[PDB]
Scaffold this active site. Structure first.
Site, mmCIF file in Angstrom:
data_model
loop_
_atom_site.group_PDB
_atom_site.id
_atom_site.type_symbol
_atom_site.label_atom_id
_atom_site.label_comp_id
_atom_site.label_asym_id
_atom_site.label_seq_id
_atom_site.Cartn_x
_atom_site.Cartn_y
_atom_site.Cartn_z
ATOM 1 N N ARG A 65 51.685 43.650 39.089
ATOM 2 C CA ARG A 65 52.143 42.576 39.964
ATOM 3 C C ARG A 65 53.658 42.466 40.154
ATOM 4 O O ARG A 65 54.131 42.341 41.282
ATOM 5 C CB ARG A 65 51.574 41.235 39.492
ATOM 6 N N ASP B 161 40.950 39.691 53.860
ATOM 7 C CA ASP B 161 41.761 38.499 53.634
ATOM 8 C C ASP B 161 43.245 38.640 53.989
ATOM 9 O O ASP B 161 43.812 37.726 54.588
ATOM 10 C CB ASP B 161 41.586 37.998 52.195
ATOM 11 N N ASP C 139 47.402 35.971 39.052
ATOM 12 C CA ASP C 139 48.276 36.769 39.919
ATOM 13 C C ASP C 139 49.318 36.001 40.736
ATOM 14 O O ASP C 139 50.434 36.483 40.909
ATOM 15 C CB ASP C 139 47.437 37.671 40.831
ATOM 16 N N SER D 33 34.117 41.289 41.614
ATOM 17 C CA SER D 33 35.403 41.642 42.215
ATOM 18 C C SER D 33 36.045 42.774 41.410
ATOM 19 O O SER D 33 35.802 42.897 40.217
ATOM 20 C CB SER D 33 36.316 40.413 42.214
HETATM 21 N N1 LIG Z 1 48.546 47.674 46.962
HETATM 22 C C1 LIG Z 1 49.008 46.490 47.327
HETATM 23 N N2 LIG Z 1 50.100 46.418 48.178
HETATM 24 C C2 LIG Z 1 50.590 45.223 48.565
HETATM 25 N N3 LIG Z 1 50.119 44.009 48.196
HETATM 26 C C3 LIG Z 1 49.000 44.113 47.322
HETATM 27 C C4 LIG Z 1 48.409 45.262 46.858
HETATM 28 N N4 LIG Z 1 47.336 44.997 46.019
HETATM 29 C C5 LIG Z 1 47.312 43.703 45.997
HETATM 30 N N5 LIG Z 1 48.311 43.089 46.774
HETATM 31 C C6 LIG Z 1 48.616 41.648 46.991
HETATM 32 O O1 LIG Z 1 47.905 40.889 45.943
HETATM 33 C C7 LIG Z 1 47.078 39.942 46.646
HETATM 34 C C8 LIG Z 1 45.736 40.325 46.295
HETATM 35 O O2 LIG Z 1 44.704 40.524 45.678
HETATM 36 P P1 LIG Z 1 43.489 41.264 45.473
HETATM 37 O O3 LIG Z 1 44.157 42.548 45.257
HETATM 38 O O4 LIG Z 1 42.918 40.509 44.388
HETATM 39 O O5 LIG Z 1 43.191 40.986 47.014
HETATM 40 P P2 LIG Z 1 41.933 41.429 48.025
HETATM 41 O O6 LIG Z 1 41.402 40.066 47.941
HETATM 42 O O7 LIG Z 1 41.468 42.456 47.091
HETATM 43 O O8 LIG Z 1 42.531 41.968 49.376
HETATM 44 P P3 LIG Z 1 42.646 41.262 50.799
HETATM 45 O O9 LIG Z 1 43.642 40.166 50.549
HETATM 46 O O10 LIG Z 1 43.151 42.292 51.740
HETATM 47 O O11 LIG Z 1 41.301 40.677 51.169
HETATM 48 C C9 LIG Z 1 46.783 40.373 48.001
HETATM 49 O O12 LIG Z 1 46.253 39.429 48.884
HETATM 50 C C10 LIG Z 1 48.091 41.058 48.362
HETATM 51 O O13 LIG Z 1 48.951 40.091 48.919
HETATM 52 N N1 LIG Z 2 39.008 42.014 39.628
HETATM 53 C C1 LIG Z 2 40.114 41.308 39.631
HETATM 54 O O1 LIG Z 2 40.427 40.658 40.640
HETATM 55 N N2 LIG Z 2 40.871 41.291 38.562
HETATM 56 C C2 LIG Z 2 42.364 41.298 38.654
HETATM 57 C C3 LIG Z 2 42.920 41.273 37.242
HETATM 58 C C4 LIG Z 2 42.672 39.925 36.626
HETATM 59 C C5 LIG Z 2 42.896 39.975 35.101
HETATM 60 N N3 LIG Z 2 41.991 38.984 34.439
HETATM 61 C C6 LIG Z 2 44.354 39.606 34.773
HETATM 62 O O2 LIG Z 2 44.656 38.423 34.777
HETATM 63 O O3 LIG Z 2 45.143 40.514 34.540
#
Ligand SMILES: Nc1ncnc2c1ncn2[C@@H]1O[C@H](COP(=O)(O)OP(=O)(O)OP(=O)(O)O)[C@@H](O)[C@H]1O
Ligand SMILES: NC(=O)NCCC[C@H](N)C(=O)O
Ligand SMILES: Nc1ncnc2c1ncn2[C@@H]1O[C@H](COP(=O)(O)OP(=O)(O)OP(=O)(O)O)[C@@H](O)[C@H]1O
Ligand SMILES: Nc1ncnc2c1ncn2[C@@H]1O[C@H](COP(=O)(O)OP(=O)(O)OP(=O)(O)O)[C@@H](O)[C@H]1O
Ligand SMILES: Nc1ncnc2c1ncn2[C@@H]1O[C@H](COP(=O)(O)OP(=O)(O)OP(=O)(O)O)[C@@H](O)[C@H]1O
Ligand SMILES: NC(=O)NCCC[C@H](N)C(=O)O
Ligand SMILES: NC(=O)NCCC[C@H](N)C(=O)O
Ligand SMILES: NC(=O)NCCC[C@H](N)C(=O)O
Lengths: 380, 380, 380, 380
Positions: free
Chosen positions: D92, D12, D121, D168
C-alpha cells in the site's frame, strides 16, 4: 613478562604494583589516566616509578571520556534503576581500552587492575579487555592474594616502604561516588560534609541562577551562548550546578554480581544535561519515537552498568539511539535553586510544537472504542 | 429524555446545562464529584438545580479515587514521558464510571461532559463510558454547539442569566494542572504566583524536614508512624510536601488527540510517594523483577494518559504490577528541602539487603565474555 | 554423608554412582524420574541398587511435569529463538525440585547430577536447587573428576563391573532432542532414520487427519471431544501428531554458557498445541493484550532456557501470562498432513469475532495523521 | 481540478473514475501499478482512457516494491500476530507514494483510491499520503458517495458504458490474500481449489527439493548459485516454493479499524525467505542481539500492518534492524516437501559457530544463583 597495570596512584594500586612484581616477577608498566578525578596524574606517574614500575604512562583523557563515552551514553537517556547516571560505569571501558592498547604496544601479555572480587568494576575492566583483545590475560590481585585485612596490607606496604595513612569514593569528570563504611547502613543518612563536588544546598546561593544549554544533533555544544568542547562543557556545568548543590542521589542498587549495595552519588553537570536534553527532546522528537526510545533506555543502562560497552547488543541499541538523537537540536533553559534543577523553557529550530476539527475526534474515539464495546457486549 | 451531566459548577458546565435543556429539551441530572478540587461541591449541586437541573447529585469520592485509581497506578510506577504523574489522567475514569452508573439508576439514555474536542479528556471520558456501557449515548457539547470564542459564550450565559466572571486549571487530591494562555509559549517561564498547592521553593522553610512513609504490600499505609486512610494519607503528604514546594514539573507533552502541549504540574504528595516507594522497592524487589517492571511502566503510563483505564491491556499489566507490588513492605525516610525530595534512609522487614567467594567472580566473567571473545577472534 | 543423585540408569550416571561412593565415602540415594523418556524407570531403580546405591527411588512424574511445568510454559506462548519449544529446558527444574525434596527427607546434605560443565543443563539443575534450598551442596562430577576420555571411563566402569554397551539424545513426554556427533556440522542434514517420536513425513499417511483440541482457561482439556488429563492429553497429541511427522525443527541455538549449538527437535504434540492455542486466542484475546503478550513471550522463553524457572522474574511474568490465558476458552480444529499442521477452524463461547460508520474512519485517520503532517510541514 | 486516482482497472475503480469527474467537476489522471498481481497493466491503462481519464499512467514497480519495501521489512523479521507476513500491508505505501508524486508532477490538488471505509487499506493509503504531502487532498469515494447497493452500482456502470462482469482476493509478488464471503465463518475450512499461487500439498511432488539462498548483507542475493535481482529472486522462490504448496496460513487477525477478520494467505517465496534468513542469522548474529531484535519485531510488524510505513517510529526501528541485518551474510539450505519448508543446513564466512573450563562454569552458576539464594534465606 610484562604487565600493564591500571595505576591510580593510591595505596592499594601501589601495594598491587609491588605485589605484581614479587608474585609474577614481571616488568610492570603503570598507566594512569586523567578523566577528571582531581589528582595530578604526573605525580601518580612518578610515584609509580618510585614504587617500582619499569615504565609509567600518564594520559589526559577528559575529552575522549566525554566525547566517546559520556555523550553516546547520554544520547540514549541512560539511567540505571531510576536514579543512577552511571558516572563510574562509563569510565571503566575507556581505561580498559587504553590498558590493552598499551599492552599491544609494549608487548605485554597481561593487564591488571585493583577492582575487588565483589564489585561491578572487575566485570567492566575484563569484559572490555577480552572483547578488544581475546587472547589477553588478566590479573586481579584482589581475587588472587592472601591479605586477610587492612592492617596486613598497611604492614606489607611498609615492609616495602610505601607511604601510608569512613567510606570509599570514585571521582571523575561526570561524578563522584561514595559507598561502603558508614554508608552500608541503608537507614543511615550520609554523614554531614561528605560531598565534595557539589556545594551543600543549605549553603547554596539565595537567588536562583539561570542556565541555557544548546544541543546540536544529540550532543550539548554550548552553555549560556559559549561554544565549549565536550570536556570543557561538562566542567562548566559541574561548576554552575555544583555551586547550587545539584545532582545528589541516594540509592540501594543491584550489582551485576548478585547483591544489593548502598550508593550515594553527586552528578551536577550530568543532572543538568539530563533535564536539558529531555526539555529539547520535548519539542524535537515525535511522540511514538519518544515512547519507544524510553522503553529501551533501561536496557541500554543495565548494559552499561554491567560492563557490556564493547558488546554487540549495546552498539546495536546505540544505532537506534543515535538515529533518534540526531533530531535533538535546540536550547533548554533551566533554573537552579538549592539542589534542584527546574526546566523553565525550551526552543528549537525545528520544534514540532505549533489540521483537524471537532468531528474528527469523535470518529477517532469511536474507532478506538470499538473493541472495548464488543468486549462489554460479549461479556453481555 | 434524560441526560446525566458531569457538572463541575463552573461557567462552561453551567452554560452546558442550559444548552442541554434548550437544545435537547431533556431532563438534566447534574453530577458533581468531590475528588479534592477544594470546592464546596454542595454549592455546585445547588447551583445546578438553580440552573435547570431536574436533579443534582454530589458525591464525596476522595477515598475511592485514591484507593481504586491513584494507588493501583502508583503501584505500577506510572510516569508519562519522564515527568507527568498523571494527576488529571486517572481522575477522569472515576467520574465517567459514576456518570454511567447514575444514568442506569435514573434510566437515562445519555450522558454528557464539557471536555473540549481538542483534548485528551474527551477520550478518557468516552472510552470509559463505552467500555462500561457499550449502548450508552454520549453528548459532547463542545463538539456539537456553534459557539465561537468566549465573548460569544459569555453572551449566551448573560442571556439565560448565569453568573459570569491567564491559564486553565484542573485540581484534585493528586495534583493541580496548569496549561494554556500565558503558558502556551514553551520558552516562557510560568508566572510568579500561579502555583496554589505548593509553597514557593524560595518561600520554603529554612530548615529541612524529615518524613517517613510506611508501605504495606504496595500501598502507603502510614506517615510518620500514623496510620492514615488512602485519601487522608495523600492529603497529609500534600500538606507536608506542599509547604516545602515539592513536586513541580514543567513539560511539553505529547497529546493523544494529535499534538504537543505545554503543561505545568504540582504533585507534592505524589512526588514524595514516588520516591518513597522506590526506596522501599530498593530493598524488597529482586533485581531482574525490577528491571522488567521499569521497562513496562512507560507503557502503562501512556495507557492511563490515553484513557485506556477500563481496558483489557491495562488490567493485564495491572496483574503484573500488583504481583510485584505485593512485596513492597517497609519504610522510607525522606528529607524535604526547598522544592527537593531526598531519600536518606529505608528499611524493610523482608529486606534482601545483606555464599560469596571472590574466585567465583572470575568464572562468571569468563563465561559472560565468551561470546565477545569469539566475535573478536572471528573478526580475526 | 548422603548424596541424592539424579540417576537416569545409563553408563555415565552409573559410573557417577560409583565415583561418588569412593570419592565422598558417602551413602548414595538414587533418584530416577519417569517424565516420558520411554524407559522402564523400575529397571533403572534396580540397576542403581546393583550398582551400589543405599536406596533407589523411582517416581512417575508425567502428570506433574505436564500440569505444573509444560502447561504454565505453553500458556506463555514460550518459543526460544523462533523455534525451540523448550522440551528439555522445562523438564530439568522438576528433576532438581525432587532431588532437593528427597535430600530433605533422607537427611542428605548434597545432591549430584551428570550434566557436563560445558552445557545448559548444569545451570538449570543448580539454579533450581539453590533457589529451593540455598544451603544444599551440589556435586557435578563432570566438573570435579579428571577422566581423560571415554576410553578411560569405559575402563573405570568395566573395573567396577558396570556393563558397557553418532549423536546425543534426550527424550520426555514433550519432545526428543538430538545433538552432537554428526549433527555438529550445521551444514549437514540430519542422518536418515534418526527421528524416533515422529514418522518420516515422506512416510506419513496419504490422507490428512483432522483433530480438535479444547482449551478451558488457558489449558488444553480435551482432544476430539474426549476429556484427558494433562499427561494423557500430551500423549494422545504426540501419537496423532507423531504419525504425521509433525513438529520437526533443525536449528543452531545460542547457549547460556556462551557458545552456539546445532540442535534437532521433534515436538509433535506440543507443536499441535502451539497452533491450537493461538487459534483459540485469535477469537478470545483482545488485540492490544495479544500484542503485549507476544512481546513478552521471548523474554520468558529465554528465562526457561537459561534455567530461571524458580526465579522471581519468571513467576512475575507468569502472573501476567496466566491472567491473559484465563480467557483462552474454546476449540481449535487442525488438519495434519505429511509434516505440516494447518489450523482449519476455531470457535469459542466468548468469541470476540462479530459499531461505527465510514465517517468515523475518516476522523480516526485525520487524528492519527496529524503528527505525521506536522513533521512534514516542519521539514518544509 | 485534477485528481490522481489509484486505478486498479476493475469495476469499482472504473465507476469511481466517472464518479469523481462529475462529483468534483475535475479531470482524472489514472495510475495503475504492476506489483505482481498477474494482470496486464497496459490493458488497465487503456481502459482508464476509455473510461474518461484525461491521462493514464502504468508503471512496472516490481523491482521497487521488493527492493525498497519487502526487503526492508523482511530484514526486521516482521510477522503480524504470529503468522501474517504482511503481503498486502507493505504494498500500500508504495502505491500511495506514487499517487503523491504524480499529483505533484501533474499539478493535481488531490488523490483518490477505492479502498472501503471499513478496512485497513484506507488508513495505509492516507497515512502515507499525508506523511509525504501534508496539504494533499484525499478523496475516498466509499466514505463519500451515496450508492446504497451493488445493484445500483451495476446500473450506474452500465449507464456509463462500463463493462460489468465467493470471497475477495488481493495478489502481488509477495502473496495472495483471501477473505470475506464463505471465509467469514472461522469454523469453516476454506473451499477446495481456492489457492492459486501454491499447489495443494496433496498434489505437490513426492520428491523433496533442496534450495539454497545466499544472503549478502541482510538481503537475499542468490538462489541455487544464480544471482537474482530482488523481484526476479522473489519470483523464483514463489515458483519453487509454490510447486511444493509452501506458505499457507489461516488466521483470524485483529484489524486496525478495531475488529477481527478471517484471512487466508499463501506466501511461498516469502516463507522460504523467512526461514532462510533466520538460518543464516543463527550463525551470524550474537545471542543478546538476536534476543533484543526478536522482542522488537512484533512492534515493527504492527506498524506495517496499521500503515505507519513512512513514519518516524518505523524508520527509527529500521535503523536498528538494518544495523543488525548488516551481519547477515551466508547461505541457507532448505528442504521443501508437501507444504513444508525445512532448514537442513546453513553456512557463513563470518560464522560465530566454532575459552573456559568446567571450573569457570561453577563460578558462573554461583554468581547467577546468589540473588536467588538470598531470596530463599530471607523467605527463611
Ligand atoms: N495495482 C494497483 N494500482 C493502483 N491502485 C491499486 C492497485 N491495486 C489496488 N489499488 C488501489 O487500492 C484500492 C483497492 O482495492 P482492492 O485492490 O481491494 O480493489 P478492487 O476492489 O479489487 O478493484 P476495483 O476498485 O477496480 O473494483 C483500489 O480501489 C485502488 O484505488
Ligand atoms: N482480499 C483482500 O482484500 N485482502 C487485502 C489484504 C487485507 C489484509 N487483512 C491486510 O489488512 O493486510
Ligand atoms: N585514574 C585511573 N587510571 C588508571 N586506572 C584507574 C584509575 N581509577 C581507577 N583505576 C583502576 O580501577 C581500579 C581501582 O579502583 P578504585 O578506583 O576502587 O581504587 P582505589 O582503591 O580508589 O585506588 P588505589 O587502588 O590506587 O588505592 C584500580 O586498581 C585501577 O586499576
Ligand atoms: N468534579 C467533577 N464532577 C463531575 N464532572 C467533572 C468534574 N470536574 C470536571 N468534570 C467534567 O470534566 C469536564 C471539564 O473540565 P475542566 O474540569 O477542564 O472544565 P472547566 O471548563 O474547567 O469547568 P466548567 O465546565 O464547569 O466551566 C467538565 O465539563 C465536566 O463535564
Ligand atoms: N529421568 C531422570 N531422572 C533423574 N535424573 C535425570 C533423568 N534424566 C536425566 N537426569 C539427570 O540429568 C543428567 C543427565 O543428562 P543426560 O540426560 O544428558 O545424561 P546421559 O549422559 O544421557 O545419561 P547417563 O548419565 O545415565 O549416562 C544426568 O546425568 C542425571 O543426573
Ligand atoms: N566508591 C566507589 O568505589 N564506587 C565505584 C562505583 C560503584 C558504582 N556502584 C557502580 O557500580 O558504578
Ligand atoms: N489544566 C487543565 O485543564 N488540565 C486538564 C488535563 C490536561 C493534562 N495535560 C492531561 O492530559 O492529563
Ligand atoms: N540431546 C541432548 O543432550 N539435549 C539436551 C537438551 C539440550 C537443549 N539444546 C537445551 O538446551 O535444552
Amino acid at each position: 613478562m610484562k604487565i600493564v597495570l591500571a595505576y591510580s596512584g593510591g595505596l592499594d594500586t601501589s601495594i598491587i604494583l609491588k605485589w605484581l612484581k614479587e608474585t609474577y616477577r614481571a616488568e610492570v608498566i603503570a598507566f594512569t589516566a586523567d578523566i577528571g578525578q582531581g589528582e595530578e596524574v604526573e605525580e601518580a606517574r612518578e610515584k609509580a616509578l618510585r614504587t617500582g614500575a619499569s615504565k609509567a604512562i600518564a594520559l589526559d583523557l577528559k575529552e575522549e571520556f566525554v566525547r566517546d563515552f559520556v555523550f553516546p551514553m547520554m544520547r540514549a537517556g541512560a539511567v540505571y534503576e531510576g536514579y543512577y547516571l552511571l558516572g563510574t560505569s562509563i569510565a571503566r571501558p575507556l581505561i580498559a581500552k587504553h590498558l590493552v592498547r598499551i599492552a599491544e604496544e609494549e608487548g605485554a601479555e597481561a593487564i591488571a587492575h585493583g577492582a575487588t572480587g565483589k564489585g561491578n568494576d572487575q566485570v567492566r575492566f575484563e569484559l572490555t579487555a577480552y572483547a578488544l583483545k581475546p587472547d589477553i590475560k588478566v590479573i586481579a590481585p584482589w581475587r588472587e592474594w592472601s591479605f586477610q585485612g587492612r592492617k596486613e596490607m598497611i604492614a606489607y606496604a611498609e615492609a616495602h616502604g610505601i607511604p601510608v595513612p569512613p567510606y570509599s569514593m570514585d571521582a571523575n569528570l561526570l561524578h563522584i561516588s561514595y559507598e561502603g563504611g558508614v554508608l552500608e547502613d541503608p537507614w543511615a543518612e550520609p554523614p554531614k560534609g561528605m560531598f565534595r563536588m557539589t556545594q551543600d544546598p543549605e549553603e547554596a546561593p539565595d537567588a536562583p541562577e539561570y542556565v541555557e544549554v544548546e544541543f546540536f544533533e544529540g550532543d550539548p555544544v554550548a552553555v549560556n551562548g559559549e561554544r565549549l568542547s565536550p570536556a570543557a562543557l561538562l566542567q562548566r556545568l559541574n561548576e554552575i550546578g555544583g555551586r547550587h548543590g545539584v545532582g545528589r542521589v541516594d540509592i540501594v542498587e543491584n550489582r551485576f554480581v548478585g547483591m544489593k549495595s548502598r550508593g550515594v552519588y553527586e552528578t551536577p553537570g550530568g543532572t543538568i544535561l539530563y533535564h536539558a536534553r529531555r526539555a529539547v527532546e520535548s519539542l524535537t522528537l515525535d511522540r511514538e519515537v519518544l515512547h519507544q526510545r524510553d522503553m529501551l533506555s533501561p536496557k541500554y543502562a543495565e548494559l552499561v552498568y554491567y560492563g557490556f560497552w564493547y558488546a554487540p547488543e549495546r552498539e546495536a541499541l546505540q544505532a537506534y539511539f543515535d538515529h533518534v538523537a540526531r533530531s535533538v537540536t535546540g536550547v533548554a533553559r533551566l533554573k537552579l535553586y538549592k539542589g534542584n534543577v527546574y526546566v523553565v523553557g525550551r526552543k528549537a529550530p525545528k520544534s514540532l510544537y505549533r489540521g483537524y476539527d471537532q468531528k474528527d475526534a469523535e470518529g477517532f474515539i469511536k474507532i478506538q472504542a470499538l473493541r472495548l464495546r464488543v468486549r462489554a457486549l460479549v461479556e453481555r
